[PDB]
């Protein structure tokens, strides 16, 4: 990895574009006015990419060589990068301030700020815009996950009277449906801020290396079947596959995909009649979890439940809702995103089925079907010093007021009612509001303030009680 090759091409040319006699470029990050976001992921970037000796003589040559061919021109700030190497032993002369990781903050608020600590390195602040803005992803995944936990919480509490097992109600299936290996790790870590169940293994090693937990691992899974693991038996021997798998895993929770050929047959005849004897003998700590995987998600879940309720002993009510026997549960893992999750739980409630009956799995919707536009994650310059004189700067495009950016030196404060407010124009310097809620997390090549994953999870809790 070469930090000199980890920016937008045009930013290689920006040092020649700022006003001459500019000693400071100050920039901030916001989710431009999902009315509330989880700040997560910066610490990963600081450690992996920005910390320590990130500039060497070889990295300067490498970049020089590439940019020459790439631009067909000698645009590249070799002098500027040599200065960092010579004066700071290749450590970035940058200070970053940030709200604690895990903090849940309404949109339109400053989440972190970036400025150079050396007047020569004025160009450096926005060189690292590209890398830092990619924090949009862990933030958006953590936020979207939490918002889905909010819906589950609402309906679990309503139908059941509590929240038992909530943190296992959305399972991460997103590993293969993601753009890369690195994305898998970052994204599965963000989901684990809210839940404890994951099939995306990459996230466990990221967390332990960059954040850490008191617990040996932040995430957990159970034995589960695949379509290959059923279909390999031959279409006439689906029952032999089912029987073999529940028996191999008789003592632990086991999930078995049941829609290879006909899910409704599989539930009514195979599980409900042929193999019922192997199911009803199962421990409460080791349910069979039937996994539908196709058809309309709502329509299929409801039909699966109606089938099963008539083949197995249903109890009712502490809230009036119906509950499968303890050794039998369902997991819906196809076509689940924030939109369809809400339609499924609402449809179940309408049909008198408790949310304690179901868990969800999500792949693409959970990790890949997200974009920087969702929360309008943006990084903009708000303050510059030119000729020893500070000015408050901003953009304000005529045709789009929603793209207007903040002015001057910023700070994040607690309001009298206990909410959040960003102060602009250096106004935080007055003592009218609180202490600044942002902390220096990186300065001159060193991470100066760290958070464990246990603190992050704590910070990102839902209110309910």
Ligand X SMILES: O=C(/C=C/c1cccnc1)NCCCCC1CCN(C(=O)c2ccccc2)CC1
* Binding flag, residue 94, a second copy (CB under 8 A): no
Among 108, 165, 212, 223, contact with a second copy (rule: CB under 8 A)? 223
333 binds, among a second copy, ligand X, none (CB under 5 to 8 A by kind): ligand X
Q: Is 292 annotated as a binding residue?
A: yes
Please report how many Cα atoms fall inside a 13 Å half-sphere around the Cα of residue 190, on the Cβ side. Answer: 32
* Binding flag, residue 219, a second copy (CB under 8 A): yes
CB-based contact 422:411 (threshold 8 Å): yes
Q: Is 227 annotated as a binding residue?
A: yes
Count of residues touching ligand X (by CB under 6 A): 23
Among 83, 233, 312, 327, contact with a second copy (rule: CB under 8 A)? 233
Q: Is 293 annotated as a binding residue?
A: yes
DSSP secondary structure letter of residue 224: B
72 binds, among ligand X, a second copy, none (CB under 5 to 8 A by kind): a second copy
Among 24, 59, 146, 329, contact with ligand X (rule: CB under 6 A)? 329
By C-alpha distance, which of 111, 159, 122, 153 is closest to 25? 122
Q: How far apart are CA 17 and CA 24, in angstroms?
A: 14
- Let me know the angle formed at the C-alpha of 139 by 137 and 142, rounded to the nearest 5 degrees: 105
Distances in whole angstroms, Cα of residue 378 to Cα of each of 7, 34, 47, 402, 406: 16, 16, 21, 12, 11
* Binding flag, residue 229, a second copy (CB under 8 A): yes
Binding mask 361-400 for ligand X (x = CB under 6 A): x---------------------------------------
Q: For residues 11 and 319, which CB has a smaller minimum distance to a second copy in the complex? A: 11
Q: How far apart are CA 140 and CA 160, in angstroms?
A: 30
Least distance from a second copy to the Cβ atom of residue 287, Å:
15
* Binding flag, residue 41, ligand X (CB under 6 A): no
Distances in whole angstroms, Cα of residue 140 to Cα of each of 37, 46, 187: 8, 18, 9
27 — phi, psi (to 5°)? Answer: -135, 150
By C-alpha distance, which of 88, 107, 112 is closest to 29? 112
Stretch that binds a second copy, among 110-118, 199-207, 322-330, 425-433 (CB under 8 A): 199-207
Least distance from a second copy to the Cβ atom of residue 417, Å:
33
Which structure tokens are listed for 154?
A: 């609402």
287 binds, among a second copy, ligand X, none (CB under 5 to 8 A by kind): ligand X
Q: Is 216 annotated as a binding residue?
A: no
Q: Is 337 annotated as a binding residue?
A: no
Q: Is 107 annotated as a binding residue?
A: no
On the 0-12 / 13-18 / 19+ scale of CB atoms within 10 A, 53 is: middle
Among 138, 333, 408, 445, contact with ligand X (rule: CB under 6 A)? 333
CB-based contact 41:87 (threshold 8 Å): no
Q: Which residues pair with 256 in a beta bridge?
A: 290
Which structure tokens are listed for 14?
A: 């920006």
Which structure tokens are listed for 119?
A: 């007047």
Q: For residues 9 and 444, which CB has a smaller minimum distance to ligand X in the complex? A: 9
DSSP secondary structure letter of residue 440: E
Least distance from a second copy to the Cβ atom of residue 175, Å:
5
Among 39, 81, 137, 442, contact with a second copy (rule: CB under 8 A)? 137
* Binding flag, residue 218, ligand X (CB under 6 A): no
* Binding flag, residue 358, ligand X (CB under 6 A): yes
Binding mask 103-122 for a second copy (x = CB under 8 A): --------------------
Q: Count CB neighbours of 344 within 10 A.
A: 24
DSSP secondary structure letter of residue 220: B
Q: How far apart are CA 164 and CA 158, in angstroms?
A: 12
* Binding flag, residue 376, a second copy (CB under 8 A): no
By C-alpha distance, which of 192, 196, 221, 220 is closest to 206? 192
* Binding flag, residue 282, ligand X (CB under 6 A): no
Task: Provide the binding-site residues for ligand X, judged by CB under 6 A.
Answer: 8, 10, 165, 168, 171, 173, 197, 199, 221-222, 224, 253, 255, 287, 289, 291, 329, 331, 333, 356, 358-359, 361
For the annotated binding site for beta-nicotinamide D-ribonucleotide, the residues are: 199, 291-293, 333-334, 364, 372
Q: Which residues are annotated as a binding site for diphosphate?
A: 176, 227, 291
């Amino acid at each position: 990895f070469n930090i000199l090759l980890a920016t937008d091409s045009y930013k290689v040319t920006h040092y020649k574009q700022y006003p001459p006699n500019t000693s400071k470029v100050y920039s901030y990050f916001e989710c431009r006015e999902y009315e509330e976001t989880v700040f997560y992921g910066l610490q990963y970037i600081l450690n992996k990419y920005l910390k320590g000796k990130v500039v060497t003589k070889e990295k300067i040559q490498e970049a020089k060589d590439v940019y020459k061919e790439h631009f067909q021109d000698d645009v590249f700030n070799e002098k500027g990068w040599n200065y960092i190497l010579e004066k700071y032993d290749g450590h970035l002369p940058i200070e970053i301030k940030a709200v604690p990781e895990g903090f849940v903050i309404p949109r339109g608020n400053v989440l972190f700020t970036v400025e150079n600590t050396d007047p020569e390195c004025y160009w450096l602040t926005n060189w690292i815009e590209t890398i830092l803005v990619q924090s949009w992803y862990p933030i958006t995944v953590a936020t979207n996950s939490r918002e889905q936990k909010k819906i589950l919480a609402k309906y679990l509490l309503e139908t059941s009277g509590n929240l038992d097992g909530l943190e296992y109600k959305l399972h991460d299936f997103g590993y293969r449906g993601v753009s890369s290996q690195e994305t898998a790790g970052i994204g599965a870590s963000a989901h684990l801020v809210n839940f404890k169940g994951t099939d995306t293994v990459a996230g466990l090693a990221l967390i332990k290396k960059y954040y850490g937990t008191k617990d040996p691992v932040p995430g957990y899974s159970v034995p589960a079947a695949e379509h290959s693991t059923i279909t390999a038996w031959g279409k006439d021997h689906e029952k032999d596959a089912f029987e073999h798998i529940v028996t191999q895993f008789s003592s632990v929770p086991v999930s078995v995909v049941s829609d290879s050929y006909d899910i409704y047959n599989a539930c009514e005849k195979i599980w409900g009649e042929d193999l019922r004897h192997l199911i009803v003998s199962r421990s409460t700590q080791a349910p069979l979890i039937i996994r539908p995987d196709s058809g309309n998600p709502l329509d299929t879940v409801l039909k699966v439940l109606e089938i099963l309720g008539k083949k197995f002993p249903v109890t009712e009510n502490s809230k009036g809702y119906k509950l499968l026997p303890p050794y039998l549960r369902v997991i819906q893992g196809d076509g689940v995103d924030i939109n369809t999750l809400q339609e499924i739980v609402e449809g179940m409630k309408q049909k008198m089925w408790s949310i304690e009956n179901i868990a969800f799995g999500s792949g693409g919707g959970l990790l890949q079907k997200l974009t920087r536009d969702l929360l309008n994650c943006s990084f903009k310059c708000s303050y510059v010093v030119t000729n020893g004189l500070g000015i408050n700067v901003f953009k304000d495009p005529v045709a789009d007021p929603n793209k207007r950016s903040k002015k001057g030196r910023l700070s994040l404060h607690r309001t009298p009612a206990g909410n959040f407010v960003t102060l602009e124009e250096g106004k935080g310097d007055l003592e009218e509001y609180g202490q600044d809620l942002l902390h220096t997390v990186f300065k001159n090549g060193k991470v100066t303030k760290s958070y464990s994953f246990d603190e992050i999870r704590k910070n990102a809790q839902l209110n309910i009680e």
